[PDB]
Every structure is written in C-alpha cells, then in structure tokens.
Amino acid sequence: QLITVDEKLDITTITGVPEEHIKTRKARIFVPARNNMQSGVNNTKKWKMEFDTRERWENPLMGWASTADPLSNLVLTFSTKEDAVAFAEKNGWSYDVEERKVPKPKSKSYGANFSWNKRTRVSTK
Amino acid sequence: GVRTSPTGEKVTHTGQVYDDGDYRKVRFVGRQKEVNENFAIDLIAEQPVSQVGSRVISCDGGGGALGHPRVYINLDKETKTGTCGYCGLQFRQQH
Amino acid sequence: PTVKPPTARKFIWTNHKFNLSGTPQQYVPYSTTRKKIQEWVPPSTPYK
Amino acid sequence: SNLIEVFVDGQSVMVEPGTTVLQACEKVGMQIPRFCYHERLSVAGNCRMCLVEIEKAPKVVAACAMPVMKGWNILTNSEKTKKAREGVMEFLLANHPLDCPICDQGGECDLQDQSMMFGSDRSRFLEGKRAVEDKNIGPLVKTIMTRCIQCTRCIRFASEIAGVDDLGTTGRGNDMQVGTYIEKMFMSELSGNIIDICPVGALTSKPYAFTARPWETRKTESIDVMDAVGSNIVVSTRTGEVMRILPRMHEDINEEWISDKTRFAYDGLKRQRLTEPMVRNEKGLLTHTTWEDALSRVAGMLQSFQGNDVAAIAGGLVDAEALIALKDLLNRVDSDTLCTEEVFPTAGAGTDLRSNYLLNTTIAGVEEADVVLLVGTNPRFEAPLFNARIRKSWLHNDLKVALIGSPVDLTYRYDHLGDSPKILQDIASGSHPFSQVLQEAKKPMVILGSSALQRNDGAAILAAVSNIAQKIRTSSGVTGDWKVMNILHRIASQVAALDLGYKPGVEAIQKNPPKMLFLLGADGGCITRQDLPKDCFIVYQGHHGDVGAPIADVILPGAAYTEKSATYVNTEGRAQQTKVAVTPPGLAREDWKIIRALSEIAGMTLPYDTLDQVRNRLEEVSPNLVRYDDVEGANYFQQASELSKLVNQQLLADPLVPPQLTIKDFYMTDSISRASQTMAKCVKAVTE
Amino acid sequence: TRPTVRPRNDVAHKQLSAFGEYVAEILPKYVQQVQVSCFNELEICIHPDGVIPVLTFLRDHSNAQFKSLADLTAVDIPTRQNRFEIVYNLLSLRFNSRIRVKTYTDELTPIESSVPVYKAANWYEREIWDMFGVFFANHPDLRRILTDYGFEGHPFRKDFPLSGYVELRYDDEVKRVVAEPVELAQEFRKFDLNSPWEAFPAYRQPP
Amino acid sequence: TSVKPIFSRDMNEAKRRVRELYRAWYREVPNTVHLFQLDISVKQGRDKVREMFKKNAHITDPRVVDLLVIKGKMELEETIKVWKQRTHVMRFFHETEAPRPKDFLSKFYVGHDP
Amino acid sequence: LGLREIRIHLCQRSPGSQGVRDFIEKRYVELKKANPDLPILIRECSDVQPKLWARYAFGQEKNVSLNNFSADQVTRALENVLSSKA
Ligand code: SF4
Ligand code: SF4
Ligand code: FES
Ligand SMILES: [K+]
Numbered sequence A: 001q002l003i004t005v006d007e008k009l010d011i012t013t014i015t016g017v018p019e020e021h022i023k024t025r026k027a028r029i030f031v032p033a034r035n036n037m038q039s040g041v042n043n044t045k046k047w048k049m050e051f052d053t054r055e056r057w058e059n060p061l062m063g064w065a066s067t068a069d070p071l072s073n074l075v076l077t078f079s080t081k082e083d084a085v086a087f088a089e090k091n092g093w094s095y096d097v098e099e100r101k102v103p104k105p106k107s108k109s110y111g112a113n114f115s116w117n118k119r120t121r122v123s124t125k
Numbered sequence B: 001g002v003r004t005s006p007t008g009e010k011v012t013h014t015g016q017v018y019d020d021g022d023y024r025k026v027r028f029v030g031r032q033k034e035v036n037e038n039f040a041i042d043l044i045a046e047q048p049v050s051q052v053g054s055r056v057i058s059c060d061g062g063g064g065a066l067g068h069p070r071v072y073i074n075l076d077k078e079t080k081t082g083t084c085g086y087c088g089l090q091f092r093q094q095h
Numbered sequence C: 001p002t003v004k005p006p007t008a009r010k011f012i013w014t015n016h017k018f019n020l021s022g023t024p025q026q027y028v029p030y031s032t033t034r035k036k037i038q039e040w041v042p043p044s045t046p047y048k
Numbered sequence D: 001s002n003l004i005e006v007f008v009d010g011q012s013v014m015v016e017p018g019t020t021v022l023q024a025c026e027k028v029g030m031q032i033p034r035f036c037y038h039e040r041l042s043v044a045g046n047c048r049m050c051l052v053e054i055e056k057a058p059k060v061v062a063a064c065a066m067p068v069m070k071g072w073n074i075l076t077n078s079e080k081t082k083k084a085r086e087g088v089m090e091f092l093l094a095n096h097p098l099d100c101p102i103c104d105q106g107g108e109c110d111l112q113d114q115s116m117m118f119g120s121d122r123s124r125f126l127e128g129k130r131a132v133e134d135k136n137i138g139p140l141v142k143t144i145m146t147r148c149i150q151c152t153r154c155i156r157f158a159s160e161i162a163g164v165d166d167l168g169t170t171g172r173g174n175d176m177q178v179g180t181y182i183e184k185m186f187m188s189e190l191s192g193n194i195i196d197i198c199p200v201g202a203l204t205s206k207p208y209a210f211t212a213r214p215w216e217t218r219k220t221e222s223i224d225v226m227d228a229v230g231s232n233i234v235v236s237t238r239t240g241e242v243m244r245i246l247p248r249m250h251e252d253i254n255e256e257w258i259s260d261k262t263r264f265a266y267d268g269l270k271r272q273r274l275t276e277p278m279v280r281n282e283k284g285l286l287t288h289t290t291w292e293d294a295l296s297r298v299a300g301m302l303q304s305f306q307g308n309d310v311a312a313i314a315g316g317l318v319d320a321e322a323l324i325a326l327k328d329l330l331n332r333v334d335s336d337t338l339c340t341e342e343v344f345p346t347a348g349a350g351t352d353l354r355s356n357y358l359l360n361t362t363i364a365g366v367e368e369a370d371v372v373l374l375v376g377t378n379p380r381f382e383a384p385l386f387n388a389r390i391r392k393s394w395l396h397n398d399l400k401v402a403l404i405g406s407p408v409d410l411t412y413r414y415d416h417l418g419d420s421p422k423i424l425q426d427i428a429s430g431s432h433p434f435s436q437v438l439q440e441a442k443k444p445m446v447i448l449g450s451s452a453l454q455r456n457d458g459a460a461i462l463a464a465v466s467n468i469a470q471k472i473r474t475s476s477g478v479t480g481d482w483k484v485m486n487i488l489h490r491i492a493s494q495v496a497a498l499d500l501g502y503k504p505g506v507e508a509i510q511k512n513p514p515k516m517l518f519l520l521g522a523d524g525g526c527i528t529r530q531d532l533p534k535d536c537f538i539v540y541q542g543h544h545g546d547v548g549a550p551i552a553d554v555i556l557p558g559a560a561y562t563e564k565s566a567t568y569v570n571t572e573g574r575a576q577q578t579k580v581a582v583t584p585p586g587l588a589r590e591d592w593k594i595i596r597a598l599s600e601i602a603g604m605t606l607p608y609d610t611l612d613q614v615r616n617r618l619e620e621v622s623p624n625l626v627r628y629d630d631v632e633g634a635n636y637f638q639q640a641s642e643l644s645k646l647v648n649q650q651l652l653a654d655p656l657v658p659p660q661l662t663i664k665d666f667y668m669t670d671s672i673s674r675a676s677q678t679m680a681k682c683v684k685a686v687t688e
Numbered sequence E: 001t002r003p004t005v006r007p008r009n010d011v012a013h014k015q016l017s018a019f020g021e022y023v024a025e026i027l028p029k030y031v032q033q034v035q036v037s038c039f040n041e042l043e044i045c046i047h048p049d050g051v052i053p054v055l056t057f058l059r060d061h062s063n064a065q066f067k068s069l070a071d072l073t074a075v076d077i078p079t080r081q082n083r084f085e086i087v088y089n090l091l092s093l094r095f096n097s098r099i100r101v102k103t104y105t106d107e108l109t110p111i112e113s114s115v116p117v118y119k120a121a122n123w124y125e126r127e128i129w130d131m132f133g134v135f136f137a138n139h140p141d142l143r144r145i146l147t148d149y150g151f152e153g154h155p156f157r158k159d160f161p162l163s164g165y166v167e168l169r170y171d172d173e174v175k176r177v178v179a180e181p182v183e184l185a186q187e188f189r190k191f192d193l194n195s196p197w198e199a200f201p202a203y204r205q206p207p
Numbered sequence F: 001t002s003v004k005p006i007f008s009r010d011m012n013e014a015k016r017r018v019r020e021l022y023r024a025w026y027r028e029v030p031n032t033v034h035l036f037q038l039d040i041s042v043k044q045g046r047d048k049v050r051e052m053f054k055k056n057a058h059i060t061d062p063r064v065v066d067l068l069v070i071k072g073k074m075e076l077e078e079t080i081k082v083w084k085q086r087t088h089v090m091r092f093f094h095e096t097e098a099p100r101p102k103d104f105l106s107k108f109y110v111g112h113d114p
Numbered sequence G: 001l002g003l004r005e006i007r008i009h010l011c012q013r014s015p016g017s018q019g020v021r022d023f024i025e026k027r028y029v030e031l032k033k034a035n036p037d038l039p040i041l042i043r044e045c046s047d048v049q050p051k052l053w054a055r056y057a058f059g060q061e062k063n064v065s066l067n068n069f070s071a072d073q074v075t076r077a078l079e080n081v082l083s084s085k086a
C-alpha cells in the first residue's frame, strides 16, 4: 500500500556529507565548452555538474599541490539540464545553470571564393 | 656546472637553491643536499657537430631500437646547425 | 665482469656507494622547481 | 518551404538549399572527419579527409564542399567511406614526423585522434620522410613546420579573419611549404588564434611550450577582462597554477577567437604581485604587516573623516562586487565621491539612462548593419574582437565603413572622412556627402569610442554624435526596433561602474581634494599626490604593484580576475561572471571581502556576508547586473538627445587621435599586461 | 573467422532470445524489458515489485532452474530519477546458462529482500546497503559490512568523493586514533582523457 | 506523490519510532560510559545524544525519518555489542579539532573559505 | 539627512511598468532639468516589478513599489521623495 508525501525531496541528512560541504558550496551546471585546440564535438554532448574551486597550496616537503577540499575532483554527468538541477536540489547544493551553447548554423559555399564582384573572392588557395 | 649560492648551498641543474632566509634548508643540517653533478646541458654541448653531405639527415639516437623514435632533420639553413629534438645531437651540411 | 666487462660511460659512477640511510650522507627530498610567483618589492625611498 | 529532403544513412533530414553534405550529417549528430575544413573559414577542400560515399554514386565526394542534392543518401560509414579515410590518413602520416612525445599538440591533436578513430593501426611506408626548415614568425607562435599537413587553415584565417595577406604557400608538389617566403613576423592582434586552428603541432604557443599536457589540465570557464568585449575564455590550470588561456565559443561575443593580449598576458599574473598587507613604517617605507593591523589603520582614518573628505577611484579591472561594496562603505560616511578613471560626459542624461553609454546595437548586430560610422576610435586595438566582427560583415555583407579620426590601419578598407571633429556637424547639417549615405541606409550604426570621450570636449563630441543618430531615426527609413547610437568601451569595469552610479572620471576628486583616498586597483595615474593635500591617507587595494601601490599609505592585496568569482559588464551591457581558477596568492583576499571586513572593523558593517548576498545587493542597485549572459535592452534615446541639447559646448580644434595608433601601443595597457614578460617581448619585436 | 575478431555464436543468441520472451510471456505483470547482448548475455529488466516472484520463478521453474545466485550488486546512475540499478546474476547448472535480472530504486524506496530465494543474497544486500544506501525490507540482519564502524555516507555513490571526508591518525594527547577532516599532501590529479572524436557510430544516440 | 513507505505511514507514526530510539539511546549512555571506560559523564553523553537528535528536528518526510531511525538503531547496536571501540564512541566529541570561529572576520583572516 | 540618489527600476514590456514608461517618456526630461545634480538612475530589466529606490545621507535607502501605477501616481511617488526627505 502506497502513501502520500507531498514535501520536496531533501536527502541532505541521510547522505552523510559534512554540513560545511552542503551549504557553503556552489555547484555549476553546464555543458563543457569545446576544447578549441580540436574540432571534435564529442565532449559537448552531456551536462556536467562541478563545484567551486578552493585553495591549493604547496606541500613544504616536495612542493606538491595540497588541498583540503574533498569535492575538488567531483564531476557528475547528466543527460539533461533538468536531471542535473533535480540532483542538485535534493542534495541541498545551491547551483548556477549555464544554458547550452550550440554553434550557429553557417552558410558555406565553395563558389563564393571566386566571386565576380564580391569581397569573398580569395586571393590564394 | 654545479655552482654554490652565497650561502654555500649547491645549485641544481634546474637552477633550484633555497634562498638566504628560507627556513626549508634546515632539512639539510646534519645531512646533505642530493645534487647530480653531471649536467646534461653541458655534456651535450661537448659533442662535436657532425658533417653530412645531404640536405636531410635522420637520427635515432644510436643503438637502433634502443635509441629514440627516428626523426629527419632539415639542414638547409647555413646560419645554424640542425639539432635532434630528442637527443640533442647536432648536424651540419658540408659546403 | 672479468669476462664480459660492462660498457664504459663518462657519467657512470667510478666509486660505488652502499645504502646510505641513517647516515649524514642520506638523501633528503626537496622541491627541484623554482619559485612560481614573484612578489612586488616596495621601493626603498619615502615618496608619499 | 524550399527545404529539401536528404538521407544520412537512410535517416531523412530536411535541409536548406546550399547546405553541404558535411552540414547535413551534423543535423543527425554525425561529425564527418576533417582537417582543412573550418566552419568559420572559407571552404578549401584540399585535405580530402571528408570524402564520403553517396549511394549509387561511384565517386566519393568531399563532404565539406559538396552541396547536397534532394534524395541523396549519404553513407557515412560504408566500406567505401571507411577505405577513403584510411587511404587519406595513410598519406597524411607518410611524411609526418615521429614527434608526439616532444610535440606540444600530443594528447589534444586532431591528427592523433582521427588516426585512432578513422585510420589504420600500422604503417607500410618504407621510405625516408620529408624534412622542412622552420620559420620565425615572431615571439608568440613557434613553428615546427615538418609537422605541417598543408591544410591552409592558417593562410585562410590570416587572410579572412585577421585581414593580413602575409601567409601563403611557396613551391609546389610535395615540396610545397606554408610560410611568409621572406623573413616576416605575423604580429597581428589576432595572431595567436592560428595556434588553435592549426590541427597539428606545426604552430604552437611559445610561452606555453613544454609546460603541460592536455589531459592533466583543469578547465575553468571564465571571462576575459583585458578589454571591454568580455570574451569568453577557458583558464587552463594544473596543480594550482595557471598554464594558459584558451578561447571559449560564444557566437554573440567573440565567436571562438581571443585577442593576443587576452591569450598571452596571463604571465603577468606571476609577477609584481601584492601578497601581503603593507603599512608605512616610521621611516616612511612600506613594510609587511597583518590583516588585523592594516585594516585597523584604515578603519581609524575612516572613522575620523566624513563627506567630501573621503573619496575612492575604481580602476579598469575592478569587479562589480567590489564596486558596490566600496560604494556602500563610502556612502555610510556620507561620501558620494565614487569615481572611475575612465571619463564619460555627465552633461544631460549623463549615466541616468543606460542607452547613453552602451553599445546598444550589440556586437552581433554589426552583422545586420549596412553602414557603420566609427568616430574617434581605433577598434582594432580597443576591441580587437569587435573589429574582427566588423571585418566579418565587411567581408560577407559588403558593409560600408567610414571613420572620423586618424587613418589607422583597420585590416579592411574604409572611407576616411577626416579627423576634424567639426565634420560631425557637417554630416548632421546635411552638408557632407556622407550625410546622404546615412539617410539612404536601412540599418545605420554610429559607434563613438570611449577613448574620444577622454578629451576635454567629450561632452560636445557625444552631443554632436548623438545629434547625427537622432536625425537618422527622426527621418525614418530605420525601423523603431533598430538602435543607431553606440558607445565602444575599452575598460572592463566601466559599464558596471556606470550602472551602479559611480561618477565617471576624477573631476569630482579634483574639485574637493579628499583627506582619505581609496585606490581600488587604480593604476592609470589620474590622481597623484600633487593633486591631493600633503597629508592625504591613500589606501591601495589591488593585485599588482604598478602605479597606485608605491604612493600608498596602506596596501591591501586583492585577487586578480582569475582568482575570484566576480561580475563584469561588457560594452553591450551584458553581465558575465568569472570563476575561480586558482586562489589569490599569499595573504591576498577576495576584493569585496576586504571592504566588508573593513566595514566591520570601522563599526559600519555592510549587510552581506556571502557572495550570493552581495549579488543580491547588486540586484537592488541595477537589476540587470545579475542577469548573466543576457543583453538587456535600453531605451529613451529621445530623452537623452533632448537633454544633450540644453547646454552647448565648444568642439576643440584638436583632431581625433586615438591613444593606440600601431600594434606596439596595443600590448601594454593595464597592470597585468604591463607586468607580462611576454607582452614585453611582443613590444620589443615590433619596435626593433 | 578473422584472427583478431571475437567470433559470433548465433545458436546461443537464438536460444537466449527464445527464453527471454518465454520469461516475458509467463511474468507479464513485472517484466518491462528483455534484451540479449551481442556477446550472448540475457537480461530481464523488471519492476521492483517483481523481485521475489521473478527470482522465485527462475530458481524453481523446471525449465529455468537457476539455483545459484552468482552475484548481486548495484550501479549508481545519478541522471536517473531512480538512480540505483539492482543487478542479479544467476547461474543454471541444469541448463549451463546464465541470466541477469535488473530492477531499480531511489534513495528512499525499499527493495524486498531476496534472502528467502537465495541465502547467498544476505551479505550481498548488506554490501549494497553499505556502499549505496539502498534499504532492503525484511532483511534478517541489515547493517554495514565493509565500511568502518560509525562510517557516514555510502562510498560507491557517484557523488561520494574518492578520498571521502575524514581520515584517521594516532593522537598522543588523547592516546587513541582520531578522525579529522581529510587533507591531502598531494591532491589526486583529475585527468580529462576522453577524445572529442566519436569512437563507436553503432551506439550513437539520436540528437 | 504516491510512494512506497519504509515503516511509517506518516509523520505521526515516524515520531513514535523516533521517541522509541531516543529512549533506547538515553538508557544506554550509562552503560556505554561504564563499559568503554570513558572519561566523560553520563550528562555529557546524554547531551551529545540530544544534540544528535536535534540536528534532524526539521525533517518532515516520514521516509527520511525512517531511514534516520534505521541508522540510529544500527549505531546503537554497534555500541551495545562493543563492535565499536572507544575511538569510535569518542568520535562524536571531536576532541582534537581546533576551534573554527564562525564569524566573517575570523574566516577572512585565515583564508578564502566562506 | 538629505536625498542623495534616486533609482527607478522597470520592465521594457510588462504592463505593470506601463505607467513608469509613460512617466519617463513625458516627465523625466523636465524632472532632470529641475534637479541637474541629482542622479536619477533609470535601469530597465526584463520582467522586474517596477520600484522607486531613494538613497539618503549615510547610505539609508527606502524603496516604493510602482507596480501598476499610472503616470500621475509615479509623479506623486517621486514628489513625495523629492520633498518629504529623510
Ligand atoms: S602534430 Fe599530432 S601526430 Fe604530429 S607529432 Fe604532434 S601530436 Fe603527434
Ligand atoms: S601550419 Fe598548421 S594550419 Fe597552417 S597549413 Fe600547416 S597544418 Fe594547416
Ligand atoms: S575537410 Fe573536406 S577536404 Fe578537408
Ligand atoms: K596547433
């Protein structure tokens, strides 16, 4: 037999996270920008959730990068913006959502390179 | 070569040396600062330039498959030598 | 090595060293890179 | 209506005529391999990696260049297609050098990755390889041309985007070489972009050389503050250090390019940094002290001064959060002398109406204009990406461009009317022939540079230019929605300051010299101790020791734009926020926190303890400052023009001469770029 | 039979497909999906209410006889509203065959305990509760099994950090082991490894 | 919003299980101090138990309450059966953690953490 | 304890800001002529409730909702601020 529970989903007290890392963090929900060094677009398909960067310092012995932020490497993947937002809400994280950036559709034409009277005529091939 | 700072601490081949007032040099008191003495930048300069009769020479570091990936070096500029990007050996085109 | 001598190189140690742990010759680790951020040094004259 | 049906592997898709096979595949989420094709460059069709089979056609077609035909079925994964890719990859790699371990492209290389996905897994080439001599094209781009695959992307970008016809191909056949033929430096304000579009390690960043590998970097998507365009960037960091700057695609701002100052000035963030609070000792020399001591000395003075005895100046790289925090702190001692270094005339509407000081047409609107009038500006160096947008419209929409000012080289030919500001009156009065051009245009754009407003007659010039834009809209022909009047800003913090009610320029500080002065990152040298009473208490908050710090009584180390989440408004009025890439060095602190901390020590606590709360305070002063990535329209140009007539001011005889006339003046404009050793190399390169 | 390519086995593929729809015909009340992979593994995806009826049928039916519970585990997929996928791997000795039964649940929905069907499931469900926080109803003895006493959180969830939140050391003042917030001398270095070029067109999702 | 319950049909039934758990913990503190030879008093132990219940007083979902109770009983059983050691029982008191002042100025002096 | 600054927030297209849009269209020019040295910051933003903010000496601020006000009501809300100073 089912029951009715109309309140919002809030699992912050049964996830075991320290309170500091719930209420002081800022999740960013975004689709990663394409790496401009490459033309492939396969890494701009899914939504990502990451957290705000915190202090890294140099280890006195070696000079390694030390951190005290347990969430420094936490990155989650979501199919849609709604999935990511819903996950952030139930875990108690404040968040910013950045709208997906899709490349504009362009009008390409090989013929324009040899225009009779336009500036698109190319001086070299 | 391995120099010493005005404090006496040896300078590594990467140019590292604790400065006058850096507490971290206490780790060497009663012990020593490990410093490799054979500086590779000085050793590779000791090698003589090799004279070749072609515009393009190849290098694999020597030793065949014990060397580095084989690369081809252009020797068209006369103002300088071609340098292997892996092992640092130098080549020049004779006249 | 009396029969098959090793190949000679100008950088190979001529004198072998045994394990030096626990002695003043022991290895002490340290960062081999130089300082990353250069700090502003204030001037040495009162112009203010 | 005119869409035609084509099939990608049997899946129907409706595409406009003129769409290429490659673009048709994109619509079903299939990315055809490519090397020479770039969607923002002219079509080349020379690498042949995009060859794809059309069903029933015996010949594979170049997908990047071939328009689709109705009913065509593109077999993106047929054996005929796969064998074509394997053959081309085999030719591409035949002479390519075995350089991956020493090549900076390694790990983010299109040749590596496409060889993995579309090529064979072995070689059958049993000959010696070609080797090419490298070529020196300046201090920013290193060339290892034996890696070049002759895709000509760099040539097309230099010609079309950068407007520099310096790169080309010499020789022919297998010996064909990309370069400049002669010894020449490719020193354009957009030159660094060719590193990004070169698919291989032939062109790489000299400053970045050998320092990192792609897989180990963390990408912080952020905003550029080197100018007022607000180019979207990726800050690459590793193990707590900033490694390089990359562009981030934003179609309506920077597309996928950044300027060379944006790309290479980050090395100024590792130099001359302010890392500890400083106070003057009993000999009058700055000495390190604690935050507790430093703020207490500031709070004591703040508690003892009121009204016009306290002033502040905001510099060019200041974020909105610090701006509102500083304003609130000074207001609570009844001070209103919150100034910026960058002047904007206050006559008439002043800063009351956003439309008076915005680029109301927006950057993307340049592509819809048919005429552009540039008045007293050098957009090439003031806003390189904005100038790139103009050349894009000049190239593709046959835009007509005219300039009032000095005849600078803008990379595109333009009509030069002159440099006399009096010409503005002639155009308005109808005397000038160009007056007919403005009347006959459906979408005219009049852009006035903020640099011209730094003259002593800025108000007259703004009144003159607004008059021209006013007459254009009264005469009709231009639709009501179109915006004709624009201001091109060059300072990252200017629009946010004006949105918040800062007074533009330091004229107020000159009328009433204050006893206590806050220099919030103010390094323009607009106020010195000659302009202040002998006992002035000067506090400098900032991240660099440049001009403001050495004259200060108290130095408070703040964060740079890479070290804080802070809000900036670009010249369009579009608010954007940076993200923390690394933390501020040493004892430096987030800028708005320093002011909030000071307000508590002085018993004047500001009502916000977190970044979210201070952004709420921003919304209460200008609600658009929290609408991130949104361009908020501003209206009432009529009222602004009405008020700009009330007081007449004289136009001087001085011709309009921009501060930056050649590239050498472009590299060092702010405190970060002035501390950049790379920017110093660029200046040396273009002056020797 | 190309030497580097794994050979297909269509006979096994056919047999497992036929049995897949056999199970779907008999338990339509609970079966939501049946699929057979290209390497011949059969999966039955069911409603969570069917855990006991479905598992009992596969164990006891004369044409099934899946007597052995090889493995019971969970997978966390945060993008799903029911983020936890519960996976039963069963072995039939009589028919020399394997089958996978999958269901789902969220953080707050109990799953019926399968100990009545398989006594082997006892510790597997304790592990799932410990590492994922999925509650199993009517478990004779549900408690942590792998984590430390008093450990907070469920480490195998995708949003639990790799190094956790606390670490241990010996403290001389209190003369005992203590737990303190985690600090790392060298932070774990996240690598971004994925190539931006698609690898497997056969699996491309529609746009 | 029709969901399968865990134990409690609504908050009224859940708060009954909460009170039952609180009694069990309250009675157990005297044994825990004695058995583990802790150097704290029964008053401190029961104040700590009270502090643990209080932090969750704001919950209104019966399912969440049920899971908190389930964990509470698991924690209690670990303590009663001496599966926990003294180090585990004392981790609730964080005796080695230095004070971390929670006012804006104090954080400002020490670092960047909000 | 005088008046230091006025800010007017409104939407460019919502019907709730129509009265504020009319006031700016007809009366802002004359209002600015009477108070040349008074910053009156108009800040439009999409889908915001119109408000009139007034800042007094020492950073005291009060705000008045202008939602659905007519142009005449906007003139009174501003007249009360410019006169009933505090
Ligand atoms: S360009 Fe690419 S394939 Fe060529 S050496 Fe560099 S990383 Fe390797
Ligand atoms: S240098 Fe790079 S971008 Fe230019 S043609 Fe060669 S491979 Fe293409
Ligand atoms: S991408 Fe089409 S031939 Fe190069
Ligand atoms: K490149």
Ligand SMILES: [Zn+2]
Residues within 6 Å of the ligand: B059, B060, B061, B062, B068, B084, B085, B086, B087, B088, B089
């Ligand atoms: Zn070599």
